[PDB]
């Protein structure tokens, strides 16, 4: 028994083994304020690099969302669906982990945190914890400024950790604004209501939809707007032409101040509490070790602020739930195994002999895991519960003779 | 010819007099790029949570043949994701393993039972133990997957 | 089990979407029978509310439940806006994905998006067990009335 | 549906028939065209 104490303190811990799907998704995170035009260029540049790897056959990049409520992705976020060639076409010593390595090493741009995950895996992780990456840290509070400050520190300590490849926390107020601060008094002078002035913001400057054409089954948007030239920039907005009700020719600056500012980019809430998620990408180490190290680095080098809370969601959250259910599950399996022996042979002393024959089958598995180079997980965990009932089945067919 | 204003004369002022009416693109809410060599328009089939993907994908792949005739000349549907391909591989893998074990067990329960009828007893303990499980799953609602077959 | 609630609030800033649409929406969905957690997304003119239900909850019970709660909250929302119920699926439901391409050039991004939106979407949605055929990418033809200020 | 040009192109030149290449809601047209050369 005291010999199993070695492989034990040598193996890693994951929630589930990384199941390899025929293909995988590129998700790359970035700072809040990117423009659709640039982000879309970022997409094609990124795809060209992905496709430059011999193992991949198709690449389907996607910034923004698809027409469905099952997709609330910003135009700043990127999901690309990478299709890997048939396994019987990979280069010599090529393996999944090895492909991802050339991908994360080839496909990379400044200020862009790479993230590679199998589709089904990812789609489920997000539906469970919300985090797209295996390791996630949730900073919560009621002061966006505070929680952002926290996520930022936690962000940089995360990249000092041995096995982390990339760590980015989404900002809660990295959004950029051009404010049209309308001046009631100024506008009133021209006989204009706030609503009157605003029509130029929604339609003249912005391209608000005004109606739709009806073409058979289909519909298409109709809209009013000045040529882009008049709405190129702030200064342009300050000289935005306005024909007042009293046929006076003025400029937007005559009834409003236009100030550039910074504020919320997208308000993320969880149970009505604002929150920022820090996406961590570690794939060389085993999971549990990484998070256990993150928990240390974070604890020692980051002083929590009053309203701020830090948490470790992701798969690790699923792992902890399962372990509390397993440690409360062993006695169950140990009193049920205890009674089916208490019944077959009826002897109290005798049965305690058989059930006490399974701590020998445990050391057997652990040594094999280590040699096979595996990690502890709900996968292996299930194996030991099943294995127990077999060392207890055997335990009886040796006491039978 | 959307009328904006008209004199007593009967001389009207049209939308064309103050505006240019052009056909342009709406604001893209999502962008799709293929193989890093072009922007494209895509479509994604979404399955009702709790229903059969494999079952659905076939109906989809077949309906697409019905349409290859109806499609405009030069239009090509290149598939970018197919969950059906993984399913087949996964179910063929567990099937294969189920066959190997059976045989490797038989061969082994046939080298300790040196009579053929003795081996063919412990052997016919599987194709029967199988059926009972599969018959049960049908009353349960458990389809075949690496996890249901893995058991 | 996940029921989505998408609300559109055109032109309104994120902070306003949160205060007038999302927040009032998540706080009531939290006190929904069987609700485990609720995730809210307040964007520029969009409000995504994700309602996650506890294990062993009848999917269609959860829906029929959210619906009745939506009714007693529709009035607590801004005049124009209406809370829409999401599809019967989730992100995991993404099963088969394809791209539309014409290499000759005869058809462009707009033509293809239309092909998708008004032909393929309807040829596929009539398939059993399919909850939604979403258009991804492409261009939506728009009649742009560009006004000369002068 | 067809615009006449005073100058800029030569008879016979090829030209793509789409402003559908730059996102309406604000791809900065000047900078969006720049991305297509180098």
């Amino acid at each position: 028994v005291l010999t199993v104490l070695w492989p034990l303190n040598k193996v890693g811990g994951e929630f589930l083994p990384q199941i390899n799907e025929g293909d995988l998704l590129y998700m790359p995170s970035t700072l809040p304020g990117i423009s659709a035009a640039e982000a879309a260029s970022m997409l094609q540049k990124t795809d060209k690099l992905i496709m430059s790897v011999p193992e991949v056959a198709r690449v389907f990049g996607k910034t923004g969302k698809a027409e469905t409520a099952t997709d609330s992705a910003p135009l700043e976020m990127v999901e690309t669906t990478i299709q890997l060639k048939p396994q019987e076409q990979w280069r010599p010593g090529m393996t999944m982990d090895k492909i991802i390595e050339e991908l994360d090493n080839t496909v990379r741009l400044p200020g862009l945190a790479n993230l590679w995950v199998p589709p089904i895996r990812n789609r489920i992780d997000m539906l469970s914890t919300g985090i797209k990456s295996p390791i996630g840290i949730k900073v919560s509070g009621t002061v966006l400024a505070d929680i952002d400050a926290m996520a930022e520190q936690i962000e940089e300590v995360a990249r000092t950790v041995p096995g982390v490849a990339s760590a980015l926390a989404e900002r809660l107020e990295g959004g950029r604004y051009i404010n049209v601060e309308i001046n009631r008094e100024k506008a009133a002078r021209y006989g204009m209501t706030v609503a009157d002035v605003q029509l130029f913001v929604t339609s003249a400057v912005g391209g608000a939809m005004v109606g739709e054409t009806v073409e058979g089954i289909a519909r298409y948007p109709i809209n009013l707007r000045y040529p882009q030239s008049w709405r190129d920039s702030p200064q342009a907005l300050r000289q935005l032409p306005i024909l007042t009700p009293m046929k006076q020719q003025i400029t937007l600056a005559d009834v409003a101040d236009i100030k550039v500012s910074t504020g919320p980019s997208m308000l993320k809430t969880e149970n009505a509490r604002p929150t920022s998620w820090i996406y961590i990408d570690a794939r060389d180490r085993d999971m549990v070790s990484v998070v256990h190290d993150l928990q240390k680095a974070i604890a020692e080098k980051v002083q929590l602020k009053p309203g701020t809370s830090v948490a470790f969601s992701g798969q690790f959250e699923l792992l902890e739930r399962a372990n509390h259910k397993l440690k409360l599950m062993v006695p169950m399996t140990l009193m049920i195994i205890f009674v089916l022996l208490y019944l077959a042979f009826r002897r109290v002393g005798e049965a305690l002999l058989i059930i006490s024959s399974v701590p020998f089958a445990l050391v057997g598995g652990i040594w094999l895991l280590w040699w096979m180079g595996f990690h502890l997980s709900v996968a292996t965990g299930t194996g030991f519960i099943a294995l127990a009932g077999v060392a207890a089945e055997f335990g009886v067919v040796m006491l039978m003779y | 010819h959307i009328v904006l204003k008209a004199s007593e004369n009967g001389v009207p002022v049209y939308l064309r007099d103050v505006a240019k009416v052009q056909i342009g693109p709406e604001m893209r809410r999502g962008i799709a790029e293929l193989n890093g060599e072009g922007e494209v328009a895509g479509g994604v089939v979404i399955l009702r949570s709790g229903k059969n993907a494999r079952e659905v994908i076939a109906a989809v792949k077949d309906k697409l043949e019905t349409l290859k005739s109806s499609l405009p000349e030069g239009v090509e549907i290149v598939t970018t994701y197919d969950r059906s391909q993984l399913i087949d591989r996964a179910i063929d893998n567990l099937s294969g393993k189920l066959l190997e074990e059976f045989i490797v067990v038989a061969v082994v329960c046939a080298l300790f039972l040196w009579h053929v009828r003795s081996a063919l007893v412990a052997i016919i303990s599987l194709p029967l133990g199988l059926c009972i499980a599969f018959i049960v799953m049908h009353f349960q609602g458990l389809n075949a997957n690496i996890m249901s077959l893995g058991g | 089990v996940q029921v989505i609630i998408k609300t559109s609030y055109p032109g309104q800033a994120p902070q306003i979407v949160e205060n007038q649409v999302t927040y009032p929406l998540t706080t009531t969905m939290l006190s929904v029978p069987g609700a485990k957690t609720v995730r809210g997304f307040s964007q520029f003119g969009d409000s995504y509310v994700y309602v996650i239900f506890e294990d062993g909850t009848d999917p269609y019970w959860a829906r029929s439940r959210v619906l009745e709660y939506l009714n007693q909250v529709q009035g607590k929302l801004p005049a124009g806006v209406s809370a829409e119920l999401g599809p019967d699926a989730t992100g995991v439901g993404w099963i088969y994905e394809y791209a539309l391409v014409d290499r000759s050039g005869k058809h462009d991004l707009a033509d293809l998006r239309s092909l998708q939106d008004w032909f393929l979407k309807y040829e596929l949605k009539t398939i059993p067990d399919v909850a939604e055929v979403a258009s991804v990418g492409g261009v939506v033809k728009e009649y742009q009335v560009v006004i000369d200020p002068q | 549906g067809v615009t006449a040009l005073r100058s800029g192109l030569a008879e016979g030149e090829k030209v793509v028939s789409s402003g559908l290449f730059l996102i309406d809601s604000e791809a900065n047209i000047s900078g969006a065209l720049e991305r297509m050369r180098s």
């Binding site: 690099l49 | 060599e37 | 005869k106 058809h107 | 008879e11 090829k14 297509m36």
Partner: peptide, 26 residues
């Protein structure tokens, strides 16, 4: 540290709708 280069400029090889400059009347 891959020195693998990609052409940054945009790309459109999946088809383009083209028309040629004609000399004619309005």
């Amino acid at each position: 540290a891959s020195g693998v280069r990609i052409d940054p400029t945009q790309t459109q090889n999946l088809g383009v709708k083209t028309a040629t400059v004609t000399r004619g009347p309005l």
